[PDB]
Amino acid sequence: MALQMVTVGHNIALIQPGFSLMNFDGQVFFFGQKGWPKRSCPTGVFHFDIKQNHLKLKPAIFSKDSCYLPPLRYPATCSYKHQYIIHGGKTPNNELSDKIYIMSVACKNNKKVTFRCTEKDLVGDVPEPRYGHSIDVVYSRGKSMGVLFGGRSYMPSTQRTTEKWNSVADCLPHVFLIDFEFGCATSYILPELQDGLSFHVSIARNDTVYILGGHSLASNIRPANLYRIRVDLPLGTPAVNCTVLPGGISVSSAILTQTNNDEFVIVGGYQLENQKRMVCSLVSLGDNTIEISEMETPDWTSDIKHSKIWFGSNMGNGTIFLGIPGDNKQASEAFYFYTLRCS
Amino acid sequence: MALQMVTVGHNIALIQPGFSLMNFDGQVFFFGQKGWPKRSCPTGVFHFDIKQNHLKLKPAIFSKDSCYLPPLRYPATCSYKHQYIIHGGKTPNNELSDKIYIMSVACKNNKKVTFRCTEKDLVGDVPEPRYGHSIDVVYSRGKSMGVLFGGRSYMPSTQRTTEKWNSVADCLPHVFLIDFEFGCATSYILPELQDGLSFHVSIARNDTVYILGGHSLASNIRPANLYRIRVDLPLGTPAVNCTVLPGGISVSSAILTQTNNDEFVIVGGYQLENQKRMVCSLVSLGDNTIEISEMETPDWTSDIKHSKIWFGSNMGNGTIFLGIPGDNKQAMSEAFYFYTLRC
Amino acid sequence: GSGLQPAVCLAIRVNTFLSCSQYHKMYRTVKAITGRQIFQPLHALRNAEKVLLPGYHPFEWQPPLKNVSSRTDVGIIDGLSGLASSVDEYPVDTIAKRFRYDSALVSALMDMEEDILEGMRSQDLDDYLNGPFTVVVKESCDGMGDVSEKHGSGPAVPEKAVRFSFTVMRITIEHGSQNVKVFEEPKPNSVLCCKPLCLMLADESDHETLTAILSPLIAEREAMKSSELTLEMGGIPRTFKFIFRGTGYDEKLVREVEGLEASGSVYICTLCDTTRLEASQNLVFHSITRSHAENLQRYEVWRSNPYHESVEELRDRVKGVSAKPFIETVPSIDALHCDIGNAAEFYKIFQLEIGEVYKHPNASKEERKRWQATLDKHLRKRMNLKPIMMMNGNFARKLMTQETVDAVCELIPSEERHEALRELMDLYLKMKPVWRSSCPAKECPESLCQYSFNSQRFAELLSTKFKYRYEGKITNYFHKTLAHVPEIIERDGSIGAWASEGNESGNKLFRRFRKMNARQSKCYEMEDVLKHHWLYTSKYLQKFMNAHN
Amino acid sequence: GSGLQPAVCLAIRVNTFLSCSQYHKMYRTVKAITGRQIFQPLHALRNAEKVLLPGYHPFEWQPPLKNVSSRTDVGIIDGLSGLASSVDEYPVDTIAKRFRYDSALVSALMDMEEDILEGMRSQDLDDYLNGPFTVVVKESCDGMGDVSEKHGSGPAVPEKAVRFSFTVMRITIEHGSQNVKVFEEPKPNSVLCCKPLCLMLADESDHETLTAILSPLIAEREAMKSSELTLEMGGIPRTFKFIFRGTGYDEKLVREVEGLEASGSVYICTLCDTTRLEASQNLVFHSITRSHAENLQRYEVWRSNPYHESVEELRDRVKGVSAKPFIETVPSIDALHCDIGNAAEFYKIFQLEIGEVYKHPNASKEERKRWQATLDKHLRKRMNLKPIMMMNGNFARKLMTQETVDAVCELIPSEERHEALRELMDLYLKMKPVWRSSCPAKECPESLCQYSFNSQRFAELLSTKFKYRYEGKITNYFHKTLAHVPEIIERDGSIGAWASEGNESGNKLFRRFRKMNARQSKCYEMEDVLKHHWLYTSKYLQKFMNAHNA
DNA sequence: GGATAGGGCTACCGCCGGTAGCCCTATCCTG
DNA sequence: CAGGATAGGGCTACCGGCGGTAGCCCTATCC
DNA sequence: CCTACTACCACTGTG
DNA sequence: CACAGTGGTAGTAGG
DNA sequence: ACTACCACTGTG
DNA sequence: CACAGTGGTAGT
Ligand SMILES: [Zn+2]
Ligand SMILES: [Zn+2]
């Protein structure tokens, strides 16, 4: 339940906010590098070598039959089965990606890695090009199905305008449903999900994925709240039901984290634009239950409290890699990073 | 017969053009800095050693009765019978010293040095503050007797104005035959010496000196002229005579080493204001004459042949110091390129 | 009568770099002495400015502009363009005040309209013609440094700016059999034709913020390509039609936006997709097959990876494009940076020849930094040229001089290398007037038509005498000069004009304004710097300045 | 006809920063637009300024000018002052340009003659008075750097520039044992009053080019210190005298020129002969003894050690000097760099308090750097102070305030340090406008009266609450600030009107003119700039921009 | 030998501190 | 053995100078 | 003989 | 082979 | 049609 | 109170 000052010798100017952190077999993988594939890493993925609490970043490679992907910042990421899903991402050409990226680990041979970042085709009511949100599969009756709580994105070109070309308007409030033996997806205008939220930290479960917090720009609000999602997924899927719940804590864009159980910890996003969420609240879910156990905020030092921003994600197991702006003589350090070991 | 690119760890830009070396008691000694005695070396002098081409300037502590003379550029320096006489020189504030400086030694134990330095009171008819010249010594009756002659100088106060505050009047060529250690001074204007010069290389051989080279700004020329200034002190009075030699050499600001007894290799200078003297000139100070045989030139570096400035003085063991500047990448990064000449 | 007109004192304000606080100083002293009403006061020429800056002269499109607003009351817009600088999103720390490419472009048009019609009546040609003014334009984005705002209002911008600055260069009309040059800009590299559009506060290296700010502009542009700005100026509708030949992007940023690997790669060209070694060997025959449409398709295959290949196989199969092309550039180069790089390489070559490195192929970095400060010292005393942290243009053209070759050969006993450098620099100075010129065929056509064999003999020399360099290597710019030059000339029509020689010539004024002639503000210093720089760049004002005759 | 007087212009050029060729653009344009020659052509401005420059208004010296030529048309002396260029002689890579001191004075006076007359009139004094004045002029020798290296016709000057600059603070006269000062400067540190004298592209790091080039200044200056001018203003020969309180030099350059030990030494003050540890225990009950002639006799003894001492105890006898002071400078300070040094020390102090170093004086180095980094980030957050490299005056004055110390106290993990920083900052604030003000007699007299106990509590907060960072390691400017301000303001009137603030701002103009208002030709730059940064700072022109409204 | 640091090129358009000097303070010799 | 030296922290002054990003590509080390 | 219009000089920022 | 300055002097148009 | 804030400057 | 600016509205 405490942290450490992870440091980066080189490639430090690669950890841009919104960067995912893939967790393959414990081995962790940076994703969402700054510019684009740089021939030091012609893919974007970065083998994330934490040693002696120092951080280094080896490159990483993709299979021949993979689709080299753009480094996505604030994408809709997941972790299920070794096999990821990555939607949106806000390509560093500031374009949102309708493309879904299924990142696996192909052949961890000779103490290295290589992935199969396959794309996918989405028949039916495709989900808009989005970002901020988090896709997550529902392990229900052993049938693959994925929930995509629409995050924030740009309007359809039938409505967009250059004066505010980057006007990001929270996507339509849904829980888009996407297959993974087909790649074809569906969705439903829920009578219950009537708030266009983005940057939630969707904690996963068999079916009761719980949509903790977020920041719905629809009124520039941080609705501390939740939402229930009951994927009825027979071979013929009928319409899901929702059951809103209380307990949701106010987080704008926080970091999920599992602990090899249903005891996920949710470490700080933002309770306020300029007053970030210095508190690390928890959860402990079951079949159709959820709580929040406010944990003692790891007593850090003068710096991170007064940073006004941070950014990161789960190192994967029970720990969170996130960083704060550290502009001193950069014109030097580009950031000041921090990992959080829980328990 | 050797050259090399001596190097410098600390205090590089302290070796300023127009300084004075001092091959003293077999130990060489820089003297005449850039700014002023810097309290890292408040002494004024520096301990010039060199091995494996990395110049060492070990600040040479002065002594109890050591009058701290200032840093003198282009002064008059004659290695007297393990002593010196340091006259004139342009103080680092750009004023001239009316004072000879007997730079004796006090102690040397443990490769250390003390430099008993005593100002000596010039008495009666005395020479004015000047510089660029070189005093020397003679032994008429086996008696150290000086010869200070030539030497640029700022015009006399009454005739000197502020528009031309930095004019340099080659002083009346008036051989100053100081009789020191019981008196100081005895001057004598010479009939054969009408146009005053400076940067004149003179030699302290027995019973006579042999002037050589220099610049008489009165003509802005480098007159090819020599002068046998003999001394003959009867029991009561001094005496002097001058006799030009046919075959003098036309250079100003040349450097006087020996490479062995009764023989001096006057290395370079400034043959023509823009065409630095790229040759040496060996001399043999016979019992009544001299023969300036041009020793084979050490073919210079690719730079001394294609720069415009350099300087130095006698490091004793037939060795000579030099410096050719370097442009402003940076201006003080390199500040020079020094060079030793064992010849 | 009774003194001046407002716009006139506006010209006498901006086209002489008078700060509109110092303008008032001059005005109030005038009142103290003149008494008369000259130099129409600040608010007068301010409501004049609002005329020249975009969003005053109205306009329209016959194919309606898609993804764009149909409003002509919008000048200085927030480049962030709705990219909320919140914590949830990317921390866009960019003071971005940008014009709109549609409105700004038409503002320049109606700003130059008197010149337009001046030329229109010329050529013994009509003035009534409303046909499609198939204008030809460039788009020059320079990324700069040492632009330090040191007490902002919270936005932690980088100490590095980038000013996407367009420029209109020629206007033509489908008059039957030909397209006349209505206003063939005399100095398309002159800053008074460097139309600023978007003065982001961001790194040339940054690639998200940069694109967050230039995705709106290129959306505007890709929609303009399709449309025709049917305005009405001179009381007449002069149907405009567009093509945005963006070339003024410095090669670094060129490779960036199109997505290519940064310079220094084994794939050095924004054109012909050739390798570094195929450039060192062939060195004269490379065909343009590397465009932005081809580049978008090429990144699309570098991702789709449909044949399922590995990294290097794809970099070879895409021929270098790793990222996704952003700007629909038209493949070309910047004579400016071409000269800067070629002269940096010649400077390396000169110091080396002082190191006789043609004989001794390899050497220590100290001996490189030596017998090279001698190059500096010698170009100091003999020639009048100094050491500079980074190369520049005055220094180049003062170095691209056979006199420079004499200067460097003054310290090289090797006569064969003397003649080597002589031929080298003479052949390069027969090349440079073919791209470094605003219009060579009209200016130096003989060198231009000899250029093919010029490049031939130059490559042959590179092989022969300068192989300690260029052994399986070459600069991006030595390839863009020894090839793609005639192709660019014939396809575009010139280089020295479309080149970025002016945008960088406008960064000087950008800094001059940010420091002197625009508010030392927090976030709207770019608002008034853009204003000011448009005003300097207003033909409607320059005409008042060439008025002497 | 609306043709201005040519000298009415030359004040709409060198006061709107225009450039000659740019003003000729304006001229051509307005002219061929309205037809009328409203402004006056470039050559008109040239022929006009030829009188505002030095060497146009003759004069004489009841005591003669020693070591000076009586000529009175010395436009722009090569700052080299006829210094030798023979490579045989020292290589002087400094393209210099000097107005002749005692010819620049007369130009400012014949230009301020308007103002002297207006003042003696508004003071009821006879405007036709031939009386012996006494002028107090402030020399501000700055050591600016990082200017440029223009591709030169041979010379290779360091990319730096000294800038000697005489600012004529006041013009006085003892009217019947009463000294009705005639010229109370309205803005002593003004961009418009620091009249540029010499612009060498030397560097204050040097003492050879600087001195080879300024010894002329100091020679004619030690002459003027003992001689009386007489300028023909309004026909009357006003017979001025000078006193030359030239004490705007920064501590680096005043240490160089006066040949002191150094800036950072066990010897701390260029005004008192006291060490650093002594000045880190008392801090309040100092004196002022380091007079320039004292330093000269001190260098005499140092160069002779008449009692024949060794290095260290000699340096304790001379108490500070090693070199020869070549200038004249009454012991005083530079309010500008005083504020700057105190503010840099305070930024360090905030690093410390952030690092709790009031308890842990052995904390690491990268932790010092991370405190600096978070503090830069905070003052960019709260006070909006983006990170600078060393320090500056806009940032110092944004910093040395009860708001910054609060937004920083919140970071300190100790309310004791909260209140200690509060007291320190607010006391230094109570005592800063003392010398930062152009005068305390009217802007903070209570500050002076209380200054004894004020600096006393300052020192005694540094002692106990700041045993760290001040166990010996007291700055130079804390010593000055604390136990020299009263001595100075008493002996010297004020301070803020004697520091080189206006000079360090005129460096900006030096850049702007060496960039826009001069011939870009190494041999000429200083000529045109010196001339133009003068016309800028010539009241005959400002009156045409201030007498309008005023 | 298959990963992992350094030093040159290649295009950019200086940025992490540049130091100038002066204490102490931390190591480095004669084995 | 013990001053003595040499150089680095760090004390000021301070108003920056020998190099640096940002890539890249072709060298070089450890089990 | 005087005023006003260009013609230069090498070099400047911006690169 | 940009371009728009950069000011002093120079050199020469209209009286 | 004039100044007055007004956050901020670049010299430092 | 460095300070003479920097547009720009505000107001008047
Ligand atoms: Zn190509
Ligand atoms: Zn003192």
Quick check: is C535 in a domain? no
D485 alpha carbon, closest ligand: 2
Asked if strand E contacts A166 at the CB level, meaning under 7 A, the answer is: no
C-beta atoms surrounding D82 within 10 Å: 18
Which one, of C398, C386, C389, lies nearest residue C146 by Cα? C389
Q: Which two tokens stand for residue C482?
A: 């020894």
D391 and D347 in contact (C-beta within 8 Å)?
yes
Q: Which two tokens stand for residue C248?
A: 């003024």
How many domains would you assign to chain C? 4
**C305 contacts on A by Cβ (under 8 Å):** 64-68
Q: A325 to chain C, minimum CA–CA distance in Å?
A: 10
Q: From CA D141, how far away is CA B129, in angstroms rounded?
A: 28
Å from CA of D280 to ligand 2 middle: 12
Could you please report the per-residue DSSP string of C147-171? ----S-SS----SEEEEEEEEEEE-
At how many degrees (to 10) do helices D415-436 and D485-492 cross? 10
Å from CA of B121 to ligand 2 middle: 35
Identify whether residues C78 and C215 lie together within a single domain: yes
C-beta atoms surrounding B141 within 10 Å: 11
Beta bridge partners of B229: B209
* Backbone gaps in chain B, preceding residues (C–N over 2.5 A): 81
Q: From CA D258, how far away is CA C16, in angstroms rounded?
A: 45
CA dihedral B263, B265, B271, B276 (to 10 degrees): -170
**D82 contacts on B by Cβ (under 8 Å):** 163-167
Q: Which two tokens stand for residue B315?
A: 């490091």
- Helices and strands: H and E segment counts in chain B: 0, 22
Beta bridge partners of C163: C142, C199
Question: What 3-state DSSP class applies to C70?
Answer: coil
**Cα three-residue angle C98-C103-C104, rounded to 5 degrees:** 60
How many domains would you assign to chain A? 1
Using the structure, give the distance in angstroms from the CA atom of C403 to the C1' atom of H13, rounded to a whole number.
38
Distances (CA, A) of C433 to C169, C282, C436, C471, C489: 19, 23, 5, 27, 12
Identify whether residues C263 and C342 lie together within a single domain: no
Identify whether residues C341 and C456 lie together within a single domain: yes
Nucleic chain H: which protein residues 7-46 of C have CB below 7 A from it? 15-17
Identify whether residues C367 and C476 lie together within a single domain: yes
Distances (CA, A) of D402 to B95, C52, D376: 51, 46, 17
**D29 contacts on C by Cβ (under 8 Å):** 8, 11-12, 544-545, 547-548
Question: What 3-state DSSP class applies to D195?
Answer: strand
Q: From CA C439, how far away is CA C189, in angstroms rounded?
A: 12
Q: D394 to chain C, minimum CA–CA distance in Å?
A: 9
Scanning C34-182, the segments in alpha helix (DSSP H) are: 42-52, 101-121
The answer to whether residue A263 neighbours chain D at the CB level (below 8 Å) is no
Q: What backbone phi and psi angles, to 5 degrees, belong to C382?
A: -75, -60
Beta bridge partners of B168: none
Question: What 3-state DSSP class applies to D413?
Answer: coil
Going by the DSSP 8-state scheme, the letter that residue A287 receives in this structure is: S
Q: From CA A13, how far away is CA A15, in angstroms rounded?
A: 6
Identify whether residues D104 and D180 lie together within a single domain: yes
Resolution in A: 3.8
Q: Name the experiment that determined this structure.
A: cryo-EM
- How does strand C240-241 pair with strand C133-134? parallel
Q: Which amino acid is at A287?
A: D
Q: From CA D221, how far away is CA D232, in angstroms rounded?
A: 21
C284 and C483 in contact (C-beta within 8 Å)?
yes
Q: Which domain holds residue D293?
A: 254-319
Instruction: Using the CB atoms, write b or e for C506-534: b if 16+ within 10 Å.
Output: bbebbebbbbbbbbebebbbbbbbbbbbb
Q: Which amino acid is at D373?
A: A
Nucleic chain J: which protein residues 92-111 of C have CB below 7 A from it? none
Distances (CA, A) of C364 to B5, C24, C369, C466: 16, 60, 9, 19
Identify whether residues C102 and C244 lie together within a single domain: yes
Q: Which domain holds residue B159?
A: 1-343
Q: From CA A129, how far away is CA A99, in angstroms rounded?
A: 8
Identify whether residues D373 and D515 lie together within a single domain: no
Inter-chain contact B162–D67, Cβ cutoff 8 Å? yes
Quick check: is D326 in a domain? no
Over the Cα atoms of chain B, what is R_g? 19
Identify whether residues C193 and C301 lie together within a single domain: no
Q: From CA D12, how far away is CA C24, in angstroms rounded?
A: 10
Q: C185 CB contacts (<8 Å, ≥6 apart)?
A: C167, C168, C169, C170, C193, C497
C-beta atoms surrounding C119 within 10 Å: 18
Quick check: is D546 in a domain? no
The answer to whether residue D313 neighbours chain B at the CB level (below 8 Å) is no
Asked if strand H contacts C505 at the CB level, meaning under 7 A, the answer is: yes
Among the partner-chain residues A308, A329, A336, the one whose CB lies closest to the CB of D381 is: A308
Identify whether residues D6 and D58 lie together within a single domain: no
Quick check: is C364 in a domain? yes
Using the structure, give the distance in angstroms from the CA atom of C204 to the C1' atom of H4, rounded to a whole number.
26
Using the structure, give the distance in angstroms from the CA atom of C12 to the C1' atom of J12, rounded to a whole number.
29
Please identify among residues 142-181 of chain C the ones whose CB lies closer than 8 Å to any CB of chain D: 148-154, 156
The answer to whether residue D329 neighbours chain B at the CB level (below 8 Å) is no
Q: D209 CB contacts (<8 Å, ≥6 apart)?
A: D92, D93, D94, D200, D202
A134 and A256 in contact (C-beta within 8 Å)?
yes
Identify whether residues D77 and D44 lie together within a single domain: no
Nucleic chain J: which protein residues 12-41 of D have CB below 7 A from it? 15-17
- Known binding-site positions of D for a divalent metal cation: 142, 250, 504
Beta bridge partners of B209: B229
Which one, of D38, B176, A183, lies nearest residue C35 by Cα? D38
* Helix (H) or strand (E) run with residue C418 in it: helix C415-435
Which one, of C453, C340, C317, C326, lies nearest residue C395 by Cα? C340
Quick check: is D508 in a domain? yes
Beta bridge partners of C151: none
Q: C534 to chain A, minimum CA–CA distance in Å?
A: 19
Query: Which of B93, B101, B275 is the best mutation test for D, with the most CBs of D within 10 A?
Result: B93
C362 and C319 in contact (C-beta within 8 Å)?
no
Identify whether residues D97 and D78 lie together within a single domain: yes
Identify whether residues D152 and D270 lie together within a single domain: no
Instruction: Using the CB atoms, write b or e for B207-217: b if 16+ within 10 Å.
Output: bbbbbbbbbbb
Q: C59 CB contacts (<8 Å, ≥6 apart)?
A: C72, C102, C103, C106, C229, C230, C231, C232
Q: B234 to chain D, minimum CA–CA distance in Å?
A: 35
- How does strand A86-88 pair with strand C160-170? unpaired
Distances (CA, A) of B241 to B78, B189, B223, B227: 21, 10, 20, 9
Which positions of chain G lie under 7 Å from any protein Cβ? 3-6, 9-15
Beta bridge partners of B47: B58
Q: From CA A151, how far away is CA C279, in angstroms rounded?
A: 48
Among the partner-chain residues B17, B35, B328, the one whose CB lies closest to the CB of D206 is: B35
**Residue showing tokens 């295959």:** C301
Quick check: is D548 in a domain? no
Q: C294 CB contacts (<8 Å, ≥6 apart)?
A: none
Q: From CA D303, how far away is CA B118, in angstroms rounded?
A: 10
- How does strand A61-62 pair with strand A114-115? parallel
Q: C319 CB contacts (<8 Å, ≥6 apart)?
A: C267, C273, C290, C298
Q: From CA D480, how far away is CA D484, in angstroms rounded?
A: 5
Q: What backbone phi and psi angles, to 5 degrees, belong to B148?
A: -110, 125
**Cα three-residue angle B218-B223-B224, rounded to 5 degrees:** 170
Among the partner-chain residues B35, B68, B270, the one whose CB lies closest to the CB of D87 is: B270
Going by the DSSP 8-state scheme, the letter that residue C193 receives in this structure is: G
Å from CA of C213 to ligand 1 middle: 29
**Cα three-residue angle B202-B205-B207, rounded to 5 degrees:** 115
At how many degrees (to 10) do helices D476-483 and D485-492 cross? 60
Distances (CA, A) of D207 to B72, D248, D299: 13, 18, 16
Q: From CA A70, how far away is CA A64, in angstroms rounded?
A: 16
Q: What backbone phi and psi angles, to 5 degrees, belong to B122?
A: -75, 135
Whether cis (ω within 30° of 0) applies to the bond prior to A4 is no
Could you please report the per-residue DSSP string of D357-384? TTT-TT--HHHHHHHHHHHHHHHHHSS-
